[PDB]
Design a binder for these strands. Structure first.
Length: 1015
DNA sequence: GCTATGAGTGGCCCCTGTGGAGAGAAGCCTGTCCTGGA
DNA sequence: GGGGCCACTCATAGC
RNA sequence: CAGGACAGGCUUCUCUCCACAGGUUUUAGAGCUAGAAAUAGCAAGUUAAAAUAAGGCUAGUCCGUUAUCAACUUGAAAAAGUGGCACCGAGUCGGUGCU
């Protein structure tokens, strides 16, 4: 028999509940065949469970990293351009200078030339470091002096300016003096480069203050001198300079010291101003306009161009390189092979900063940038939507609000529809002359004045007309020619002008396109038009409203709004009327596009990708549940911190509804109407919560993971209750211990390792940053991420004698080696010293792979060297009820009688606490093996045994954190903190039972490792 | 008897900050309304 | 919040 | 009754592109004096280069952390196919009968 069965669902952010029940609230149980090589051939399981998986991630970080990579690449390209310009003369002075610049990061053993980067000899380097202690001194020297300097110093200064050219927030060239004063604290020192003067002044103040502080400290507190000037570990000056301490840390540490001594008034004031001992490369410099650097560059080039012809002949190139920037409406410069590129090319030469404007069509680039993201019209998927400020759109809005305005005058039996002449007269008299029009204004100015209807009753509008001809008023203010605005032949020209003013944002390109239409207006109008900008887009297309014409009458939807006779069909009525070809045109335009895959259709929805993942997982769960029951289709499907999580929980319902309804019923009747064999019911959680609260089925999110399954089961029960012993059946179902809980196996992806680059050490677990940079000499990354684990059976030459030893262990692959591993596993396994590879025994072990051990103890393979708790705790319902009522003993919100009775029930069964502790201890002994922590918990229990009941319950709820699924977590019990017990040994599972589970946990194949790899 | 290697227990660490431009989606209220059920 | 790493201590095989 | 559409305000979030300021790492910036060395005293400390996921071929001023992923058979892959039912009981499921 096709037993009537229903599928209930509870959809969360990371969990998917599923349940199958009969017509009488019972969950059938089946005997399932079990594959593998073990003895257990058949296992009986209930048709109830739940699924858990990791939260989905937004694509923000990948985009950020991509933008950063592009920043780095473009900066290096600019440096390469500068070296390309300079290299010709460099060979005549010192040909190996650029080699030394590139090869500085290596040790002296790996340097191909002398170790000194700048001059190549120690005397000149010392002289340079003495004469110019900081680069700002060299910059000021080149700006102010008239001396012929060595080209190397010029290159150094120019490269330093180019690599750190500063921001672009300010437009044009350079109350403003106050902004400069905030940027530039220099007062009167007469030079063209104030920034260098400010930095030098800060350096001098730092030097003098350091000398004074050394003097005073050595005078009065000799003992603290060592801490301040030698100890790198503390937040003192040594830490501020040679350590990692920040400025605020240094000020906070130095504040009490200066308070203890005299003569520190000015130093304390400077500390209050954050001006004491301040570096040159700080987080303050973000506010520097790039025009200062441009001016310094220009001054240096102007002063030095009289000695070096190539500097003079290439000054424009250098200024461009400093000032060149790719417009934000162009995008990446790729030849089609990049999925983010939309640039259109005039030719195929290499793009350089000196010829960018000739190769890339900026206008077409902006058009493609704007168009590729705009919505398409739903009714006509082949057309773009008009701008919201378009004239036809405003006319459509005004008339559509006016279309259903019904007017009643004295002597008229029924409300009448406005005539096209009336519509046009009203619009011309009020809307084209007033920005906002109310009902009283209409009554006074059209009915009373024009048609002499002194009293009129107007229905359909209460207060006013929200539509407005704002664009009309703006164009009348600019053009000041009503005849030009009212011309029908200029409607195309006006629409083109509006579209041009809406698409682009640059003044130059807007002028460029509108230059073809300057023949109609003066220069003042063109400039006034130039400054006008509009944003936003509509929801309808031009072709729908005024482009497609009814072949019988030739009218458009615009004409139907203006003049259709007594019918006065509005926008909703015009599309649904069968007398017009427009609805036939709509159905024809419903392109039978290639059926989006369920993945694609889910990916096409609105929300974070995590909710889409949840949708796909729920659909696959439903599909497998249907497959299990003999492919007989079901009757009914009943479906249901940080804010976005619950937002997505409420957002799931509708989409799950239409996707399930679409896939389920695919058969149409003889009239092409869909025969709906499946009923989709959406219910909000409040009804289920009320059902829970009325019948004492409390929900505790801290005990275990059966709450999802119970929520789904109650969802199905309550949903089927309205469309169609019972409480006894529910109570029997809820206390069932065997529930299918499944953890989804995953292959980890992401960054190769952590980002903190650590100093050099003598260890084998450091990762090089390049191909030829041994970490023992240069340090590197740490903590690589495990991709997945493979079981290997082979022989290893061990010991100093290199003796072959047959082995069986786990070797986890890092994400950096996944491609290398799957390219040729034999070569990779030979690389790590394993020989006589047993290819047939390679087993894929992703994260959360499950192993079964004796006494039912289970472990999930968290990584190549760590395990997680896999066994689940099952508690009787009475203990759950007692614990919940105890935890909210004083938080009960209800009638006094029931609250007092529940509190009395809590009072009576205090002996439950010992039973709860004993059962927790037994479960921990049997599956957790946490003897020391268990003893600590037991000792703490007896210690606080006189505490009030509610506090006892609150502390007990914390205990289940030790027994929950996943990685062990620390928890607090009264005043005691319990450390986390971590399993760092994976050897015990090499001879255990390996289990593969279906996505619902019913189909499974068991593999025993004790037989694999045997001699 | 000496040294080296695994094996358990406790402890410390994990890149940050902003500007400019656009497009879209969702939810909450008022007006105007439709499509299905019943 | 959760997995890699290190310092210290300690049992044991090789020798 | 549920869902849906167009306008007028309120809020929150998502997707794409263009820039800037840091931080980290190694090296360079002759430490001295006394002492055989361990070590003790003195002195100085603000800056610079390179890299910032290993790299790849389609060689671009491009791409590299989004999503998808139980097992077996066909398939390069996408993709497709592959596993009995009923009845009684319940500590991670057990028992009874049929096929």
């Amino acid at each position: 028999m096709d037993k009537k069965y229903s599928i209930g669902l509870d959809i969360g952010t990371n969990s998917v509940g599923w349940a199958v029940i009969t017509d009488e609230y019972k969950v059938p149980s089946k005997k399932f065949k079990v594959l593998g090589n073990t003895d257990r051939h058949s296992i009986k399981k209930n048709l109830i469970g739940a699924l858990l998986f990791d939260s989905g991630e937004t694509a923000e970080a990948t985009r950020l990293k991509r933008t950063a990579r592009r920043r780095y690449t473009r900066r290096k390209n600019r440096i390469c351009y500068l070296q390309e310009i300079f290299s010709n003369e460099m060979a005549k002075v010192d040909d190996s200078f650029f080699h030394r610049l590139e090869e500085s990061f290596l040790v002296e053993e790996d340097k191909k030339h002398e170790r000194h980067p700048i001059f190549g000899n120690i005397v000149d380097e010392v002289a340079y470091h003495e004469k110019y202690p900081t680069i700002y001194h060299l910059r000021k020297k080149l700006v102010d002096s008239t001396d012929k300097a060595d080209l190397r110093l010029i290159y150094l200064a120019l490269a330093h300016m180019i690599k750190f050219r500063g921001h672009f927030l300010i437009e044009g060239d350079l109350s403003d003096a106050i902004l400069l004063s905030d940027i530039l604290r220099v007062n009167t020192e007469i030079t063209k480069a104030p920034l260098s003067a400010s930095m030098i002044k800060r350096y001098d103040e730092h030097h003098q203050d350091l000398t004074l502080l050394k003097a005073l400290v050595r005078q009065q507190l000799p003992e603290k001198y060592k801490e301040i000037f030698f100890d790198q570990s503390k937040n003192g000056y040594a830490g501020y300079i040679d350590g990692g301490a920040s400025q605020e840390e240094f000020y906070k540490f130095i504040k009490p010291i200066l308070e203890k001594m005299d003569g520190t008034e000015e130093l304390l004031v400077k500390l209050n101003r954050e001006d004491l001992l301040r570096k040159q490369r700080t987080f303050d410099n973000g506010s520097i306009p790039h025009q200062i650097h441009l001016g310094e560059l220009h001054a240096i080039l102007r002063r030095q161009e009289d000695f070096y012809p190539f500097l003079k002949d290439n000054r424009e190139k250098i200024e461009k390189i400093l000032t060149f920037r790719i417009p934000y409406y162009v995008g990446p410069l790729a030849r089609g092979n990049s999925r983010f590129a939309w640039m259109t090319r005039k030719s195929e030469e290499t793009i350089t900063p000196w010829n960018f404007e000739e190769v890339v069509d900026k206008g077409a680039s902006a058009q493609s940038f704007i168009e590729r993201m705009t919505n398409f019209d739903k009714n006509l998927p082949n057309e773009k939507v008009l701008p919201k400020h378009s004239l036809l759109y405003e006319y459509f809005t005004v008339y559509n609000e006016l279309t259903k305005v019904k007017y009643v005058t004295e002597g008229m039996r029924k409300p009448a529809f406005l005539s096209g002449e009336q519509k046009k007269a009203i619009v011309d008299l009020l809307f084209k002359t007033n920005r906002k029009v109310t009902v009283k204004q209409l009554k006074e100015d059209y009915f009373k004045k024009i048609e002499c209807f002194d009293s009129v009753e107007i229905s359909g509008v209460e207060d006013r007309f929200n539509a407005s001809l704002g664009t009309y008023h703006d164009l009348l203010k600019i053009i000041k020619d009503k005849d030009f605005l009212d011309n029908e032949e200029n409607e195309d020209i006006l629409e083109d002008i509006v579209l041009t003013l809406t698409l682009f944002e640059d003044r130059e390109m807007i002028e460029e396109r509108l230059k073809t239409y300057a023949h109609l207006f003066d220069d003042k109008v063109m400039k006034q038009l130039k400054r006008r900008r509009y944003t936003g887009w509509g929801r309808l297309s031009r072709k729908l409203i005024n482009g497609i014409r009814d072949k019988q009458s030739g009218k458009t939807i615009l004409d139907f709004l203006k003049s259709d006779g007594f019918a006065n069909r509005n926008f909703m009525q015009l599309i649904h009327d069968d007398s017009l070809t427009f609805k036939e045109d709509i159905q024809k335009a419903q392109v039978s596009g290639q059926g989006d895959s369920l993945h694609e259709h889910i990916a096409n929805l609105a929300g974070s990708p995590a909710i889409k993942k949840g949708i796909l997982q729920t659909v696959k769960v439903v599909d497998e549940l249907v497959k299990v029951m003999g492919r007989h289709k079901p009757e009914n499907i009943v479906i249901e911190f940080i804010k976005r999580q619950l937002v997505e929980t409420r957002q799931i319902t509708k989409h799950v509804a239409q996707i399930l309804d679409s896939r389920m019923n695919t058969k149409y009747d003889e009239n092409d109407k869909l025969i709906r064999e499946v009923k989709v019911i959406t219910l909000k959680s409040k009804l289920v919560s009320d059902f829970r609260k009325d019948f004492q089925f409390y929900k505790v999110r801290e005990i275990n993971n059966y709450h999802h399954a119970h929520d789904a089961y109650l969802n199905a029960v309550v949903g089927t209750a309205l469309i169609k012993r019972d409480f006894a059946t529910v109570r029997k179902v809820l206390s069932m211990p065997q529930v299918n809980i499944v953890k989804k196996t995953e292959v980890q992806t992401g960054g190769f390792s952590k980002e903190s680059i650590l100093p050099k050490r003598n260890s084998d677990k450091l990762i090089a940053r390049k191909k030829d940079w041994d970490p023992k000499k240069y340090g590197g990354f740490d903590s690589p991420t495990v991709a997945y684990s493979v079981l290997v059976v082979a022989k290893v030459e061990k010991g100093k004698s290199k003796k072959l030893k047959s082995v069986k262990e786990l070797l986890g692959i890092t994400i950096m080696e996944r491609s290398s591993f799957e390219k040729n596993p034999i070569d990779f396994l030979e690389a790590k010293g394993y020989k006589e590879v047993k290819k047939d025994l390679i087993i894929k072990l992703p994260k959360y792979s499950l192993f079964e051990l004796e006494n039912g103890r289970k472990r999930m393979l968290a990584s190549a060297g760590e395990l997680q708790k896999g066994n689940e705790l099952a508690l009787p319902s009475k203990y759950v009820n007692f614990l919940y009522l105890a935890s909210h003993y004083e938080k009960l919100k209800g009638s006094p009688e029931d609250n007092e009775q529940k509190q009395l029930f809590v009072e009576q069964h205090k002996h439950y606490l010992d039973e709860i502790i004993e059962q927790i201890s037994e479960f921990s002994k049997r599956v957790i093996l946490a003897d020391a922590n268990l003893d600590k918990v037991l000792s703490a229990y007896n210690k606080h045994r006189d505490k009030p009941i509610r506090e006892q319950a609150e502390n007990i709820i914390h205990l289940f954190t030790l027994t929950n699924l996943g990685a062990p977590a620390a928890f607090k019990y009264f005043d005691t903190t319990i450390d986390r017990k971590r399993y760092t040994s994976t050897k015990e599972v090499l001879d255990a039972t390996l289990i593969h589970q279906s996505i619902t946990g019913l189909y499974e194949t068991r593999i025993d490792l004790s037989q694999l790899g045997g001699d």
